[PDB]
Structure 1
Amino acid sequence: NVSIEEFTHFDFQLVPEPSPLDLVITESLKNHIEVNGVKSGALLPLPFQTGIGKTYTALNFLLQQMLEQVRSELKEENTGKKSKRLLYYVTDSVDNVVSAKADLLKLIEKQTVKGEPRFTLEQQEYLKAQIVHLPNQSEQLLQCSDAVLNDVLIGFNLNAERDVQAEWSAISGLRRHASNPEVKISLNRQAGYFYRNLIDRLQKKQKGADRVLLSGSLLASVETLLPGEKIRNGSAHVAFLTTSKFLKGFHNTRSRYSPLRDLSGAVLIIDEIDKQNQVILSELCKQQAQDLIWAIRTLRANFRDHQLESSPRYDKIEDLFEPLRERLEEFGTNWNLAFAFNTEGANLNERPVRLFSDRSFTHVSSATHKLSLKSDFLRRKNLIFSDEKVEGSLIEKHGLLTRFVNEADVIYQWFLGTMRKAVFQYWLEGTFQEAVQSLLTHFNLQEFESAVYESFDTNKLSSSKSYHHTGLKLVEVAHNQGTRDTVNCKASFLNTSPSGVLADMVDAGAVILGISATARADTVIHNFDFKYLNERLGNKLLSLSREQKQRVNNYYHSRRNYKDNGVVLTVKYLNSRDAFLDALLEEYKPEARSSHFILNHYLGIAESEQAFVRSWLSKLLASIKAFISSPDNRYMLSLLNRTLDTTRQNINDFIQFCCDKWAKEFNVKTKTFFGVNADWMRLVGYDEISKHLNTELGKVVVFSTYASMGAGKNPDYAVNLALEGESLISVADVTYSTQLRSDIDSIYLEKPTQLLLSDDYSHTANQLCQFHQILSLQENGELSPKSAENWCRQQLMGMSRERSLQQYHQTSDYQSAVRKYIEQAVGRAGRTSLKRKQILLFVDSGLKEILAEESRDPSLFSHEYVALVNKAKSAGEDRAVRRLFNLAQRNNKDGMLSIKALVHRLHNQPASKSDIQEWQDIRTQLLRYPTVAFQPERFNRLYLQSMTKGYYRYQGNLDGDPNSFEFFDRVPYGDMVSEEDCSLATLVQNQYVRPWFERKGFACSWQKEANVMTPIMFTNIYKGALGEQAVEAVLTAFDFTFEEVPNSIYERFDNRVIFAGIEQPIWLDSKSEGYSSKIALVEEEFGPSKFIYVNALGDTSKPIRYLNSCFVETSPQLAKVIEIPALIDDSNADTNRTAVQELIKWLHHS
């Protein structure tokens, strides 16, 4: 046993001579402390080339953080405020986790400083004990010996129980001869289940007063069985685990510990950071679907009278649930939740009903019809009946079924959020389970336990609005199982995107060190949205600077000095070679008739696939022939999209025939390797190729795919100088730890094909992550809102996989994904410093134009990628501009559809206080800031970024379809949003308005900025607010008093006005049967009243018009409404004093 006192005389100031990569990380984290403070989280993307010391740099950083903890604990032990700072190493694959942990232990054991060992044996034993590995529970159980788990069973008295020992005996008996595979899957399943049950048993044994005291051998065996216990004890603080395990959490003896809830102060090294986007997405897609009708009915029924204890431990928790109870009661009253729900009329059995909605706009329903929702009190049923509406008019009146589903979703997510808030108020994580259980048991809501547990780790125009913080919802309405007269609305949600999860980790306080060569690829399908992360994290999103990038570039050049050593990179772009393929086919089958027939019959190619196969086969064979005829290249790797395994044996024989023909012609024996699969590499190790190149003479062709050659696989081989000739040279300026190895020297790159994420697994049957793609593209601006909504519709209606690909192809996100594949392919093939004197790169010619447009900063590119790009370009439409157009339309249609909902809610009496507050907030924001200099956070979708500062032209029917808005110079002649078009200058010249505006802080003019209000805001809100403020400004100085119109008829009239000395209630409207209906509505509640219709601007000479309740002209004494046509003169901004005096003269005649 070792103790921390071994480091008492350790020199913490002596470090190994740092690489430029280590210095870059250290400098960036130093600057982070200066800028963001000590307790701030951070995200540092590190575009390090793998194969030039990436893993060593990450593990050396991890070791330095380990020694900082030891130094801090030695120095500050007297303080007592122990903070065992957690360090995580996560990556997506199990083998990479294991390999990284092994390499860290090796680094501890073998690191030297100034030719002397870094650590003594006791120091090594201490550090290696701080590191823990957390696999899945099945593999965790199968690692433990029978001695350890028998010790655990004895110490916790579970050995007496019949079923426990029966299952453990069965698992042991399987474990003796688990060599067979099917035995291995069965053993894995039972091992997982048994580990679950057993850990449950120690957890209930430990929570109570019968807590088994753990020490000595029992403690060691428990820590071996539950490595998470070492983290709880404070004996270990470094954890190696996968991303899926990190999201799911790991057990200790006390509970399950979730790292996401305790990220404050953690340091989290994520390898292959941009792969983790779709890993997190797949973890989020696996949530359990749940029925909204049952959920809302249970919530309504149980929140009606159940309540908590009213004790000090439940302070302020009932107040959290108080608004939700009121909302549930109102919802159940409105939608008649006393009745169940059913479908009436159109046959739901032939097809259920699918509803798609992103919770903001772009709503799509699989039903052609307007599904409405009716409560029949003659029966006792809520009927989803089908008006015969057509699918084409999706912009018709909003039906009731969608409204019901949206409100039910809002209430359900509100319940889950209130549960989170109440758990935090009840209390730092052992309290979580108890809080959830006590709250759910007091409310009799124990059925929501799994939902709260699963979701816990994961007024809108006035908020920063984004899809990544909001997500999407897809609800299918179908008959209940076993019944034919009740319907359920099962809903599947994404409440956040993986970018939202990563930004939440950074906000919680984690310092995240994301390492990948393509960590900043400009795609959102295949990467995190770094436009969103930069908006949300600000400068907590760290970035290595130009000087640091130059230093890293120089360091990479010093280790890969191709030019000073004579290594040449040759690039060819191959198109189809139809005559060459035809000659080869006619040689393959000499006595057949035609090469088309040979393709069809002997190769087995249908008439549809002939052209495609002739295209991709000719290029592959031409590259192979050019490889074989080369004098001294020895190692090719084809990267296709399909695997050439036994399912395509007829093509492999032809390819083998051609390879043998060319091996004879050029007199070098070439050993092919077909079907290098994931399975092949699991079964037959990749070192078979390595051993072949180590021992045999001649060339080697390897057929693989992009998908097969993932991260972590090392295709380098051990060099035998007797076989290499003199073609190997060392490109590193200083070489150490000789171990001569080399790598690939020819490569064929096919154009990557199926680039939309599609796992085709069981959990992908709901197509949720196929809507996430369209909605993430629309967030970026890669799609117009029209295109995104249409693609969402076709995805609801059932879409061919081919057609989704075609929709994806027309974005520039697509081309960035293609280049991200190509850049990762050639990057993984370059992992040593012994190189040929020539390296051949054969490229599909369909990749030429796509690679011709790589225009980012080449400071961190690999040499092969630079060569590919330069060769592509030498044979030679903006993306931000198209993004600007699309985001103009999207910010428009977002505000257009959200204002409509807000006004519809205000016209639904009573108007809720939050709605009135949001309305006032929007108007105040637009009045104060018509334009803003930087992209606003809190009101981001009142504005659009214009290509011209302070103004823009737009065309679009403000009460028609929001998909058909156009914008900047695509529309030369149309409407225009500017300071002039709202007549603000005329308004501000008035001697009464201007003091009011300067006092209120409203803008007297528009700043010439890039962010200007959207057309919906300008036309529908800004002008009305200007008119209201101008009218109030003038009339308040003529002894009128202004107070708010109450919630019964809010927004129908702008302000109640009260003049001194007149007691008749007066009302104001500022800018016929509908107006008379409003007249009747107000006078029904408040009796006889005066109503004023006034326009702030206009011709003051036109006379004042006096109308009755029916809006017919009459005498002033008999009039009920006065229509003042112009309060301020539009030519020179003088007050219309005559009109106001006539108005007050009428008011005296009341």
Structure 2
Amino acid sequence: MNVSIEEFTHFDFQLVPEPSPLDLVITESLKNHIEVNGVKSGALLPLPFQTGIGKTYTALNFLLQQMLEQVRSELKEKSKRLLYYVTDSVDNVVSAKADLLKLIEKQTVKGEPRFTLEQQEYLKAQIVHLPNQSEQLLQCSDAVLNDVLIGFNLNAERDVQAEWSAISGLRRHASNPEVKISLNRQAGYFYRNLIDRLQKKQKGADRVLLSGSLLASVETLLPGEKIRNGSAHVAFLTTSKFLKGFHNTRSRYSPLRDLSGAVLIIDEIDKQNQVILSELCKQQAQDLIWAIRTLRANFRDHQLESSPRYDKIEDLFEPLRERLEEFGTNWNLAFAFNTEGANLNERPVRLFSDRSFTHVSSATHKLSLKSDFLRRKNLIFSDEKKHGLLTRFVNEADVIYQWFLGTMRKAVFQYWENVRGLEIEVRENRSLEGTFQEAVQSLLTHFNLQEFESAVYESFDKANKLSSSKSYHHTGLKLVEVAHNQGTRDTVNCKASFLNTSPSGVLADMVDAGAVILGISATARADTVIHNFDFKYLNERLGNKLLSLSREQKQRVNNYYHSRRNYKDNGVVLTVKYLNSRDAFLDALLEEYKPEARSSHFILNHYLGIAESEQAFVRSWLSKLLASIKAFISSPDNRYMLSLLNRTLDTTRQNINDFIQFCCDKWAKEFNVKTKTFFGVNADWMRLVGYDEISKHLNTELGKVVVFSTYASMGAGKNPDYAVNLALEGESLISVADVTYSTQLRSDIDSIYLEKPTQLLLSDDYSHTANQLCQFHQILSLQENGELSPKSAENWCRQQLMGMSRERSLQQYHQTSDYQSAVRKYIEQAVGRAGRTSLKRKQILLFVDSGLKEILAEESRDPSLFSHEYVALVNKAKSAGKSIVEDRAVRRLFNLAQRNNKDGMLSIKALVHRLHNQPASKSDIQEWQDIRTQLLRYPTVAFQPERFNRLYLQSMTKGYYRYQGNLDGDPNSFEFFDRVPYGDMVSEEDCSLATLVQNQYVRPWFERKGFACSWQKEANVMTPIMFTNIYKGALGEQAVEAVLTAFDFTFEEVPNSIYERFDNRVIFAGIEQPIWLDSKYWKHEGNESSEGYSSKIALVEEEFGPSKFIYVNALGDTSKPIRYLNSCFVETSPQLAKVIEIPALIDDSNADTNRTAVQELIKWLHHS
């Protein structure tokens, strides 16, 4: 019996629950954004909320509030706005849903109930909890499934009834973990087939009109149908289910394509960076050779129907059609590829690529690619002693493959616009999701490309040019393996695995789609990119859509947390101790345990199972662990110790367990304690009935409980508390809340040991390729931030490709400043998990490793959002031995200065080479103009530009800086700023633009085109490689023409076969022999050797026979006479000189035009 909206017609929407300082924060930052950035824009508001004072409560109270708000609009009236609540763990998701259903019931406004019972039925019917397919099946009764099987005529198939018999046969014999593990695998497979047949029988021809018990049975089995049907607001799913989508009665709905208006309420947002990365590293690897050959063959003549339903789609594939033909002709795709040249066949070749400056390869010799014509086979070979290189082919082939996939997405979007207007039978599914199924099918069928069906479906969820906003976070690494195919012995396949975007890029894509994502986590703005999103990229990409909190709002939160946690005025003590290696302390204990052995080392190898390899480490985490144990036993009032180690002390290493068990029992007797220890408490242990047992012991018994867990084993949802009895605990407890929210007599831990967090480098275990992408993402995300200079990041990526031990990987991570903010994120969570109960002890102890004393002393954020128990852990470290600085932001600048230079050196070298082929592409020339147009119009930009971010270089000095490095050599050896105080200055004085603009001819020309006359005094100065090679080279080019403009000389476009080889085509004087140009800025750049120059003449002598040349150098010394040089470019007589070299046109002393030189030049071109 579904419930209508008639009860909300009498609802008093004016009446509202009383807001909270935590509640006001969420709405305050959102209302202003809506009235500034528009209504349908989106936002990425993070909220740094402490875990104890109201994360859920406020999170779910916001989710409920949006549920109530939409109902009023629907009642006052269209599709409901979705309100996903994405988390990481199923336990947390179900707990959040249960609390929400709890909240709808017992929430009382001003002391009286708010929701009538009927309203609760309506609101509860809007919430959904879509689980995985396996658990979805083992939730509905046998009657519910039988109605679906009978009502859809699926009982007449042998396979369907055979499977369902087994599922019903097994689920009846439940209650045994051995059976439980196979009912879940079996349930998932049957669920796919049952829904697949349900969708096949429903999407075509016959369509069952769902109603009555068939609707309830089909909605119970398909909760995603409740959303598609049209009565469901909220979904309660994990991140993995959000990234994989959920079935409705028609197809598989993906929320990533329907984000416009979504209100994602992602909880513990920082953890989703690793979760989203696990979905991205789990994509299928595609053969590049097969895909490119298949695309080339099915495109040369495979027309698409000329109907109004496919207009403008034939044009999106035209540039791809020509490129595929050109690509096939260049690399001879009619043949198959195969390696050659032994010392290349023993092991495969892996070719990492950033699609940018980082281009590490695992073949120590550069591999060429020759196209043999006698033996009809493309051969990959090595040449130990160029256009035809293996890396150039694979990069070119990858660009085309993603060009097709990119074009495929535009065609699908174009198709939807063609059919949205056509109102024939499109039904309610007129969105890009309803037509995605069809638009991909129709286009892949006409082109015969049905093999790419999966690769297009699974990938449907700012290019790599210097004239764009380049970044790794909308780009990706590309791991390619070139190994022999299976079975056949003389062919290879390019098994390419892509990472086309990043979890931070994915998060930005959600907000740009229109999502209103809310980040609810304490460490939601950490200064690491390994365990979080890059919030410096998300700041530049989103801009003002990345909402923040003002001074008063973060000050208001601290006051709220200071009230609900009033530690000092009520009276408590936070004792903090730092524990070192205490070899003497542990020696006495080990001797006293088993003194009969020769020495303590025998105890290590007899009763502890430790050799002379780990003895230095095991002692370190045993001496520090035990020393904290006895200090807890010294205090009788405290009776709860949680040790958060990194190694799971359980039945595995039980030899250690009994030694520490004996030490706890030994100290118990001499301190008058009946203590208890709870060993082996890992994720398995709390599951069955585990962590409730520890609560019961402190509920009734008298003693001290010591718990040995790990950081991983205390992820989230775990509530380390217990029920307190005043008979058990006397005046030890004391309330800290200024007011009194519900009681229920609960306490929490009062003394926790915090060992150093280790193994902070992310990992994946899905496959070897699956974590290969994960490890390469981490290296390239540290380099993009600026933690690693490109010298070391490329070194790390080269080792990562060849093969490294996990110890080597972590030793590189430890060397960066990202690792400090990573470990200070683990602690900030571990300390924050113990403050979930207001009613607290007075003597709260804190013991942490001394390997963290220096790390903790580096914390430098604002306590205005910190917890009460973490500032105490950091204040002791501040009031300690030494307090120094690490200069976080200045070592970042030295790396981003080095990085942007390396990008210019690598991209420009590729742009020039791609201009050395005939013809030059229209984009390539257009991009070349924009590089020079922006570079010399804006010599210094005020802010950080969002369109030419690799052109510039942030400097510690305004308007200039000093560098030192081989400008035409290795870009990894550059040094900047104070590293080289005697280097080459990149100021405006060095280029001497002031002398150039003093001229009466140059100055007027710049004003018309806006070219700079002076450099501003901002810190975003130009790159070194793109100031001498692109800027001074182009500054003279404009200066030369402007001087020669006022002498009846006009210049035209160089043709598309010698572009960039010559400045401009010169006309006038009436002479048929065309006049060319070679413009430079002085004689000290552009050597232009005679052999090199003679090469340029031949390529243009073939063009138009005889030719003339001029070697104008603009600025310089005007005193030196002109010279007359021959085609051999050595010396000759004047009248037999093919080329002429003018030393300068403007004086470098007082900026005087070379009137005599041009007059002879004017006279010379008349004679010639």
**Given the two structures, how large is their TM-score scaled by the length of structure 1?**
0.98
SS of 2:676's equivalent in the other structure is: strand
| Residue deviations 1:1005-1036 (CA, integer Å, cap 9, x gap) | 11111101100111100001100000111112
- The residue that corresponds to 1:407 in the other structure is 396
SS of 1:843's equivalent in the other structure is: strand
CA distance, structure 2, for counterparts of residue 459 and residue 479 of structure 1:
31
| Residue deviations 1:1076-1130 (CA, integer Å, cap 9, x gap) | 1110110101111111111011111111111121113223322211111101111
Is the contact between residue 728 and residue 837 of structure 1 (CA under 8 Å) also seen in structure 2?
A: yes
Q: CA deviation at 1:348?
A: 3.9
Of 108-117 and 758-767, deviating more is 758-767
CA distance, structure 1, for counterparts of residue 197 and residue 952 of structure 2:
57
Q: CA deviation at 1:761?
A: 4.3
| Residue deviations 1:651-698 (CA, integer Å, cap 9, x gap) | 111101100100011011111111111111223421111111112110
Is the contact between residue 348 and residue 482 of structure 2 (CA under 8 Å) also seen in structure 1?
A: yes
Is the contact between residue 884 and residue 945 of structure 1 (CA under 8 Å) also seen in structure 2?
A: yes
Would the alpha carbon gap of residues 295 and 459 (structure 1) be closer, same or farther in structure 2, given more than 3 Å must change? same
Q: CA deviation at 1:180?
A: 2.3
Of 1121-1130 and 930-939, deviating more is 1121-1130
Is the contact between residue 316 and residue 425 of structure 1 (CA under 8 Å) also seen in structure 2?
A: yes
Q: CA deviation at 1:82?
A: 0.9
1:417 aligns with 2:406: yes
SS of 1:714's equivalent in the other structure is: coil
| Residue deviations 1:69-100 (CA, integer Å, cap 9, x gap) | 0111112xxxxx81311101001111111110
Would the alpha carbon gap of residues 747 and 541 (structure 1) be closer, same or farther in structure 2, given more than 3 Å must change? same
CA distance, structure 2, for counterparts of residue 1041 and residue 762 of structure 1:
64
Q: CA deviation at 1:398?
A: 8.0
SS of 1:647's equivalent in the other structure is: coil
- The residue that corresponds to 1:21 in the other structure is 22
Of 106-115 and 149-158, deviating more is 149-158
Q: CA deviation at 1:950?
A: 0.4
Q: CA deviation at 1:504?
A: 0.5
CA distance, structure 1, for counterparts of residue 344 and residue 287 of structure 2:
18
Q: CA deviation at 1:536?
A: 0.4
Is the contact between residue 950 and residue 1012 of structure 1 (CA under 8 Å) also seen in structure 2?
A: yes
Would the alpha carbon gap of residues 169 and 840 (structure 1) be closer, same or farther in structure 2, given more than 3 Å must change? same
- The residue that corresponds to 2:1167 in the other structure is 1149
Of 958-967 and 713-722, deviating more is 713-722
- The residue that corresponds to 2:614 in the other structure is 609
Is the contact between residue 763 and residue 771 of structure 2 (CA under 8 Å) also seen in structure 1?
A: no
CA distance, structure 2, for counterparts of residue 266 and residue 580 of structure 1:
59
Alignment of 1:105-184 (within 5 A): 105-184=101-180
SS of 2:562's equivalent in the other structure is: helix
Is the contact between residue 464 and residue 470 of structure 2 (CA under 8 Å) also seen in structure 1?
A: no
SS of 1:833's equivalent in the other structure is: coil
How many residues align? The count is 1138
Is the contact between residue 765 and residue 771 of structure 2 (CA under 8 Å) also seen in structure 1?
A: no
Is the contact between residue 459 and residue 914 of structure 1 (CA under 8 Å) also seen in structure 2?
A: no
Q: CA deviation at 1:178?
A: 2.7
CA distance, structure 1, for counterparts of residue 730 and residue 226 of structure 2:
54
CA distance, structure 1, for counterparts of residue 692 and residue 769 of structure 2:
35
Is the contact between residue 749 and residue 843 of structure 1 (CA under 8 Å) also seen in structure 2?
A: yes
Identity %: 100
Q: CA deviation at 1:764?
A: 5.4
- The residue that corresponds to 2:1134 in the other structure is 1116
Is the contact between residue 282 and residue 766 of structure 2 (CA under 8 Å) also seen in structure 1?
A: no
CA distance, structure 2, for counterparts of residue 348 and residue 1053 of structure 1:
43
Of 292-301 and 158-167, deviating more is 158-167
CA distance, structure 1, for counterparts of residue 827 and residue 172 of structure 2:
46
Q: CA deviation at 1:16?
A: 1.3
CA distance, structure 1, for counterparts of residue 158 and residue 26 of structure 2:
56
CA distance, structure 2, for counterparts of residue 187 and residue 243 of structure 1:
24
CA distance, structure 2, for counterparts of residue 734 and residue 128 of structure 1:
32
| Residue deviations 1:580-629 (CA, integer Å, cap 9, x gap) | 10110011112112112212222110111001111110000000011111
| Residue deviations 1:317-359 (CA, integer Å, cap 9, x gap) | 1110111111111111111111111111224443211111111
Is the contact between residue 734 and residue 841 of structure 2 (CA under 8 Å) also seen in structure 1?
A: yes
CA distance, structure 1, for counterparts of residue 162 and residue 723 of structure 2:
49
Is the contact between residue 282 and residue 770 of structure 2 (CA under 8 Å) also seen in structure 1?
A: no
SS of 2:696's equivalent in the other structure is: helix
Would the alpha carbon gap of residues 398 and 895 (structure 1) be closer, same or farther in structure 2, given more than 3 Å must change? farther
| Residue deviations 1:973-1026 (CA, integer Å, cap 9, x gap) | 111111111111111111111111011011111111110110011110000110
CA distance, structure 2, for counterparts of residue 716 and residue 348 of structure 1:
62
CA distance, structure 1, for counterparts of residue 108 and residue 353 of structure 2:
59
Is the contact between residue 951 and residue 1023 of structure 2 (CA under 8 Å) also seen in structure 1?
A: yes
Alignment of 1:915-934 (within 5 A): 915-934=924-943
1:46 aligns with 2:47: yes
Q: CA deviation at 1:1131?
A: 1.4
User: Paired residue for 1:1077, among 1082, 1095, 1101?
Assistant: 1095
CA distance, structure 1, for counterparts of residue 176 and residue 927 of structure 2:
65
1:430 aligns with 2:434: yes
**Given the two structures, how large is their TM-score scaled by the length of structure 2?**
0.96
Structure 1: 4+ residue segments shifted above 4 A: 763-766
Is the contact between residue 991 and residue 1134 of structure 1 (CA under 8 Å) also seen in structure 2?
A: no
| Residue deviations 1:623-645 (CA, integer Å, cap 9, x gap) | 00111111211000001110001
Is the contact between residue 370 and residue 399 of structure 1 (CA under 8 Å) also seen in structure 2?
A: no
CA distance, structure 2, for counterparts of residue 459 and residue 153 of structure 1:
52
Is the contact between residue 764 and residue 770 of structure 2 (CA under 8 Å) also seen in structure 1?
A: no
CA distance, structure 2, for counterparts of residue 937 and residue 687 of structure 1:
54
User: Paired residue for 1:1047, among 1018, 1040, 1056?
Assistant: 1056
Is the contact between residue 459 and residue 918 of structure 1 (CA under 8 Å) also seen in structure 2?
A: no
SS of 1:818's equivalent in the other structure is: helix
| Residue deviations 1:165-219 (CA, integer Å, cap 9, x gap) | 1111111111111322232222111211111111111212222221111112211
Runs of 5+ consecutive residues of structure 2 not aligned to the other structure? 417-431, 1080-1088
Aligned CA RMSD, in angstroms, stands at 1.3
Is the contact between residue 174 and residue 180 of structure 2 (CA under 8 Å) also seen in structure 1?
A: yes
CA distance, structure 1, for counterparts of residue 817 and residue 716 of structure 2:
25
Q: CA deviation at 1:34?
A: 2.0
Is the contact between residue 370 and residue 388 of structure 2 (CA under 8 Å) also seen in structure 1?
A: no
Is the contact between residue 1042 and residue 1056 of structure 1 (CA under 8 Å) also seen in structure 2?
A: yes
SS of 1:523's equivalent in the other structure is: coil
Is the contact between residue 906 and residue 915 of structure 1 (CA under 8 Å) also seen in structure 2?
A: yes
SS of 2:763's equivalent in the other structure is: coil
| Residue deviations 1:299-323 (CA, integer Å, cap 9, x gap) | 1111111121011010111110111
Is the contact between residue 1091 and residue 1122 of structure 1 (CA under 8 Å) also seen in structure 2?
A: yes
Runs of 5+ consecutive residues of structure 1 not aligned to the other structure? 76-80, 390-396
CA distance, structure 2, for counterparts of residue 559 and residue 163 of structure 1:
61
Is the contact between residue 950 and residue 1011 of structure 1 (CA under 8 Å) also seen in structure 2?
A: yes
Q: CA deviation at 1:762?
A: 2.9
SS of 1:1125's equivalent in the other structure is: coil
Q: CA deviation at 1:554?
A: 0.5
Of 273-282 and 131-140, deviating more is 131-140
User: Paired residue for 2:821, among 810, 816, 819?
Assistant: 816
CA distance, structure 1, for counterparts of residue 938 and residue 1074 of structure 2:
34
| Residue deviations 1:420-440 (CA, integer Å, cap 9, x gap) | 000000003100010001111
- The residue that corresponds to 2:956 in the other structure is 947
SS of 1:604's equivalent in the other structure is: coil
Would the alpha carbon gap of residues 266 and 319 (structure 1) be closer, same or farther in structure 2, given more than 3 Å must change? same
CA distance, structure 2, for counterparts of residue 459 and residue 242 of structure 1:
34
| Residue deviations 1:522-564 (CA, integer Å, cap 9, x gap) | 0000100000000000010000111000111101111011111
CA distance, structure 2, for counterparts of residue 182 and residue 1146 of structure 1:
99
CA distance, structure 2, for counterparts of residue 162 and residue 800 of structure 1:
52
SS of 1:721's equivalent in the other structure is: coil
Is the contact between residue 348 and residue 478 of structure 1 (CA under 8 Å) also seen in structure 2?
A: no
Is the contact between residue 249 and residue 256 of structure 1 (CA under 8 Å) also seen in structure 2?
A: yes
Would the alpha carbon gap of residues 497 and 32 (structure 1) be closer, same or farther in structure 2, given more than 3 Å must change? same
CA distance, structure 2, for counterparts of residue 384 and residue 180 of structure 1:
57
Of 1136-1145 and 975-984, deviating more is 1136-1145
Q: CA deviation at 1:701?
A: 0.6
CA distance, structure 2, for counterparts of residue 935 and residue 726 of structure 1:
59
Q: CA deviation at 1:230?
A: 1.1
SS of 1:200's equivalent in the other structure is: helix
Q: CA deviation at 1:1060?
A: 5.2
Is the contact between residue 642 and residue 751 of structure 2 (CA under 8 Å) also seen in structure 1?
A: yes
